Design a protein around this ligand. Sequence first.
Ligand SMILES: CN1CCN([C@H]2C[C@@H](c3nc(-c4ccc5ccc(-c6ccccc6)nc5c4)c4c(N)nccn43)C2)CC1
Ligand SMILES: CN1CCN([C@H]2C[C@@H](c3nc(-c4ccc5ccc(-c6ccccc6)nc5c4)c4c(N)nccn43)C2)CC1
Ligand SMILES: [Ca+2]
Ligand SMILES: [Ca+2]
Lengths: 289, 289
Amino acid sequence: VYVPDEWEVAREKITMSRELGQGSFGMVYEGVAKGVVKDEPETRVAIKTVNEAASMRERIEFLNEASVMKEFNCHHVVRLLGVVSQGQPTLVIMELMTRGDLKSYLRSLRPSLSKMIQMAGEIADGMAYLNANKFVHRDLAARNCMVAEDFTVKIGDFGMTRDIYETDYYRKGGKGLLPVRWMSPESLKDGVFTTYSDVWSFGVVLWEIATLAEQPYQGLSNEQVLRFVMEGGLLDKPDNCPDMLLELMRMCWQYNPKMRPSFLEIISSIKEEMEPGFREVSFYYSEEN
Amino acid sequence: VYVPDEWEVAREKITMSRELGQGSFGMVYEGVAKGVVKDEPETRVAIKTVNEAASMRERIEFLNEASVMKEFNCHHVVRLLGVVSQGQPTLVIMELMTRGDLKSYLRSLRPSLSKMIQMAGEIADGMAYLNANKFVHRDLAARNCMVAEDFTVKIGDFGMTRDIYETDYYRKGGKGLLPVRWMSPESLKDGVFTTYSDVWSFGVVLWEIATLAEQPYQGLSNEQVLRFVMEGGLLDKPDNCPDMLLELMRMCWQYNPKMRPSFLEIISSIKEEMEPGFREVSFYYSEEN
Ligand SMILES: CN1CCN([C@H]2C[C@@H](c3nc(-c4ccc5ccc(-c6ccccc6)nc5c4)c4c(N)nccn43)C2)CC1
Ligand SMILES: CN1CCN([C@H]2C[C@@H](c3nc(-c4ccc5ccc(-c6ccccc6)nc5c4)c4c(N)nccn43)C2)CC1
Ligand SMILES: [Ca+2]
Ligand SMILES: [Ca+2]
């Protein structure tokens, strides 16, 4: 059961155009929304839809998982703008990230130390924010980080591990997809995700940044990755990777979860390298922190 | 490992236009293929693609599962026309079914006894053919039957249970999606599919035809369907369903697999109701049979 509230948007206020790609729960479209942002008649938006064909259960979980974003207000986490819970299709309205996902962006360059570090700190800041709001992402990867008009990186789609719904197919136990090349040794073992395993994934994202989105554990099957990582195996250090990002990856990949830095500590160690602008928009320097 | 052969088509001979929907292994497109059919410079075709992002393993299994169709030659099974195994994307070229899948077609009418029976016999004939060629479909459903220009129904996509590959996600054990509302009590129990469980699914297809593609076990969750069917539970008889199709469903849904008719026996019992044309195109009346 979902209860409509102030986040509800009338469908006539929405138009959709081009497909942006299939995320968790369904297709994302570019569109236009009326009356979603302060002091503008209309805003270009991203609209995620749940198919008409989808079960009522998926449709409800879609809305409930998205509704966690009603509490979020961070420059480095993609904002929820509204919801359409009445009629078909069920829609989630979000801040439009016009340069798409970070993985695809990285592939397209196939950056400098200053730009690599700014991305790092932006991602860590969005994550520090979420973790402080008691939220574990569980699917931090470059594919789930997003790039804004001005190249600011923000935290995106967390739904992939929470969407266990396929319309006419059912997996024996009822479990879901797991992002094994981004997961910590302890999460591979028991399937629980924590603040500390998010930090593990952050190191993988830095590695993805440093290799321009190479496939983690490039030469190994999924079964081989499970074994390798659970036995303390680690990703190769990228070519010409600045020492600072190498140092960060290594701290993020401590086998023992309690020995990894927090996100606030990661930012703390690289704050001298950030744009002056970061002090005004980040959660790190905010009153909240 | 896939070994290229006579089914190989040069990529320049292929153009693709509109999306037809995501099947197993990937997106299907309408397109045009040069030199794929006898006595025509070009043929409108369906082209299924495997994404550039997909693993080499998925890409190889795509081709190997599709390659079973190289042995098939039946009017009531969608034909393979060619393969493009060199370069990206990996393509499977097929006979274009211009009215799309049977489920969507059924929804669009929301037929007569004569038309219902012709569909029945066409589907049973394609299935009789596959079963005689030692092939178990494992995913017979109206969504996986296809409608031709002249409204002839043919057997389509068998890949959904064979495609266990997600690019950056991995399901714990390694297993796949199962079509539980179309599966027999014995297949729900041990996950093995047979000739007899295909016949079970055929009854479900007849029910789908008779209800204009209602959802099987409409009011029950997936876990409730498992229990219900394994305890001998059966689908409600459709409103105004002619007795003949009711009789066929019931024979198809005998709890004991060995007590269901074969597909040849199903056709045998309804052959007086088929178009005279059926005798010329069917496997049933063919020399092969
Ligand atoms: C392999 N990947 C497949 C999907 N690809 C597409 C999805 C598309 C996309 N997604 C979003 C977007 C951004 C932030 C989100 C944050 C949360 C959720 C979410 C929704 C429902 C339930 C749970 C989580 N969805 C979100 C969706 C956005 C966005 N905000 N702006 C533009 C494009 N977007 C990028 C990328 C590559
Ligand atoms: C819920 N569903 C989602 C997918 N939807 C779309 C897929 C699209 C489609 N698919 C085909 C087509 C038809 C016959 C096939 C037969 C075999 C395989 C196959 C391919 C690779 C590996 C294993 C099997 N793919 C096949 C694909 C065809 C076709 N031959 N002509 C036109 C459209 N087609 C209809 C329908 C509804
Ligand atoms: Ca889903
Ligand atoms: Ca797949």
